[PDB]
């Protein structure tokens, strides 16, 4: 049983591009006709995006599908390796559910990780999450992002409800489409922070926006299981688990905690790792990617 030379996993938890529109706080429940934040030039020549001078609230809206079926690859050479992989993943799901991963995903939707620099220095951040079955709203959640911690994953009743929704989505027991809307008090005429292009700023039809893969980066910050230090905080799930800004690569292949090493030792040789490393490996399968040689 050698490894498959071609492996490819399609991603789950597919977000969209977030749109930003500015308005006034306590006009917050009618946030449907708010004008968009436009990207303009000023003088070297750069691009800036600011709120209007009579508005102090940033609105960031995006959607999120939860697909499910997180074990089946989209391309694989071997048939025995693929069946062994499906028995391993089905063994994982039958031993324990998706409650841990959906709990941490629920905590990253609870606070405002997807407000990267816009969160820093704000008076109050409010997150509203809707579940959608038809042209309707099934169940609405309203959170408070500053009370919910940035580093401490503490339980709650509403987070257990939404974690049951996401965990029911990833298992393939239904269709899950969520609408996420975030509200931030920044100040009158202050500066918002869209994502930067390859100083140009990313936009859609006359509105500043954030890329989808950056929100997708903000959702999958699970990994509190580094060998080096658990005191810094959870940084996102990657094979050869690395941080581009810090210039460091945690979870080295010279150790035995890499994704490729744990996947090879747990599929081919039946050497099951610790439980939290199994959460890491299944988190990389929900991430998806191009694996194999």
């Amino acid at each position: 049983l050698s490894t498959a030379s071609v492996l490819a996993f399609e991603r789950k938890l597919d977000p969209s591009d977030a749109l930003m529109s500015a308005g006034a706080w306590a006009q917050r429940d009618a946030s449907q006709e708010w004008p968009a934040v436009t990207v303009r030039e000023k003088s070297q020549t750069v691009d800036v995006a600011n709120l209007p001078s009579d508005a102090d609230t940033l609105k960031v809206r995006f959607t999120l599908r939860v697909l499910g079926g997180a074990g089946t690859p989209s391309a694989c050479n071997d048939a025995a390796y693929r069946d062994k992989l499906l028995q391993t993943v089905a063994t994982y799901v039958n031993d324990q559910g998706f409650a841990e991963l959906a709990r941490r995903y629920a905590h990253n939707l609870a606070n405002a990780r997807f407000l990267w620099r816009n969160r820093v220095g704000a008076e109050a951040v409010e997150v509203r999450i809707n579940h959608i079955r038809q042209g309707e709203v099934a169940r609405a959640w309203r959170f408070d992002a500053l009370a919910i911690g940035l580093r401490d994953f503490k339980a709650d009743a509403e987070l257990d409800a939404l974690a049951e929704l996401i965990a029911s989505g990833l298992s393939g027991s239904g269709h899950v489409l969520l609408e996420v809307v975030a509200f931030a008090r920044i100040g009158d005429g202050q500066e918002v922070f869209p994502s930067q292009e390859l100083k140009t700023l990313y936009s859609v039809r006359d509105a500043a926006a954030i890329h989808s893969q950056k929100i997708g980066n903000a959702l999958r910050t699970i990994d509190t299981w580094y060998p080096d230090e658990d005191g810094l905080g959870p940084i996102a799930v990657e094979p050869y688990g690395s941080v581009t800004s810090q210039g460091k690569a945690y979870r080295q292949p010279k150790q035995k905690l890499d994704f490729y090493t744990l996947l090879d030792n747990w599929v081919l040789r039946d050497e099951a790792p610790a439980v939290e490393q199994q959460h890491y490996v299944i988190a990389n399968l929900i991430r998806g990617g191009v694996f194999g040689e």
């Binding site: 990780r113 620099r117 820093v120 220095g121 810094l232 959870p234 940084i235 800004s245 810090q246």
Partner: peptide, 18 residues
């Protein structure tokens, strides 16, 4: 303390504003 969304230089700039 360390954070993944920024290095210590940006935290020193924002804390310099604070």
């Amino acid at each position: 303390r360390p954070d993944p969304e920024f290095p210590p230089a940006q935290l020193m700039c924002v804390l310099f504003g604070k």
